[PDB]
Amino acid sequence: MNDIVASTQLPNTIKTITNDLRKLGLKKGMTVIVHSSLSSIGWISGGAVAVVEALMEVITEEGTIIMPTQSSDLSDPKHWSRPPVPEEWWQIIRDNVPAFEPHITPTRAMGKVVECFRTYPNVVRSNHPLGSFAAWGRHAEEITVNQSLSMSLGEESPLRKIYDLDGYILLIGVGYDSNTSVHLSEVRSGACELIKVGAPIIENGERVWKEFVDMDYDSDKFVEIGVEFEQKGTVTMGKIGNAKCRLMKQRDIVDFGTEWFRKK
Template identity: 50%
Template sequence: MKEADVIKQLHSPNTRSSLHENFQKLGIEKGMVIIVHSSLSAFGWVCGGAIAVVQALMDTVGSEGTIVMPTQTADISDPSEWQMPPVPKEWWPIIREHMPAYDPQITPTRGMGKIVEAFRTFPGVKRSSHPTYSFAAWGKEADNILSEQPLEEGFGPSSPLAKLYELDGHILLLGVGHDSNTSLHFAEHAILNRDKVKKGTALFENNERVWKTYEEIVYDSDCFAALGEDFEKTHAVKKAAIGSAECKLMKQRLIINFAREWLNNKDRL
């Protein structure tokens, strides 16, 4: 959509102050711990773009709060898994040998959106060391949340998602649905007899770039939209339109507990 058409959709522009006010109306409070999933384009026109959204979120939770965003880098993975687009099989060994290692300071995100990419570069934002499933965090609990994330079970019981669960944090969906709700991958670790797959990635080990193989459960977000829809039928989710974006705020612990049961029942059908 052209920018002129986006402007016509709104009576007034989204700004840092209007977003702050609307985030408060949605239910975000000072001191909250929130994991954010977002689409900048969903808001319509924003004065200051992604920077204004990040600033408004920081204004709303304050320095005593914490903001977390997934900063995944799916392109630092085994090329045999690539589908959008795939690469020729004869390229695979070359990519494994030459792919630059993940560096939390400089490695850009892939497919996470403009708000996430802006957030990871903000002063005071820190980032975890996982080469494909990293998270960035800012605020009071940032160090705690990012303190550990093993290569295997990157979304599992020792991950930033688990720390958010322990802290009774919230999930904030800004113009995106539950198919973007990364926390639900944490719930997948409760699936009985979950299949595993071998993966590969480029990382630094003892200050040297290496290609590392490891084993991980099969993560699958295809059912997350249906899962989220069922959750919202029986649980409280705060909703509001902010600009053109449908936004939702919910307790992470509630949807994780629901998802664990839902996923296991689904797999038994």
């Protein structure tokens, strides 16, 4: 934090961030899925609240803001490795981890901007216990309704709904490994194996551990895909404070990713 204020010239505010967003190409009425590192921007007056307000100010309620709200800590620990936990714990975990409830369950590894966004009034969250998304604005409901349990990031997911809307991806101080949309590419290309997974959900007031099938999503190759992707020169670079940012069309990178995976 001292290091954060030391590397900032002037405070970042809703105003300067709004300014930065516009200069990068974000504009009123866009559909945008946002991925962020708060700290990467520099010191901000109002922290995560400023970033969220700045985004809503640029996009407005006539546009749509989306952010991933994953909650991987609800998953079956059979498959954990960062870190793993003892096998003797696994059935205890399956019988005791609390059910997902959209209005309550914290995200994991999404960031403070997402934790703040998902709590705002009028923000709605899809119902997936592991791979949910939150959305605000014109298409918030359409984007978040009826996510499939199996194939969570596939053709019935919010990622597909953003695709159909010809939306944008905004990366703030993070790389392609945070670019959730490329999972749609994985799905389309068959680039991962299916695995037996589980997660806790509420079925009419009762907690149930639900078993389902999903792709073993792996962001391994996303960074390499982004490098090759940016050689076609359709990604806007720009800064929000100290942060290196990227604005791109979601269909561009999803279509590119699908072909990339197919070539292997």
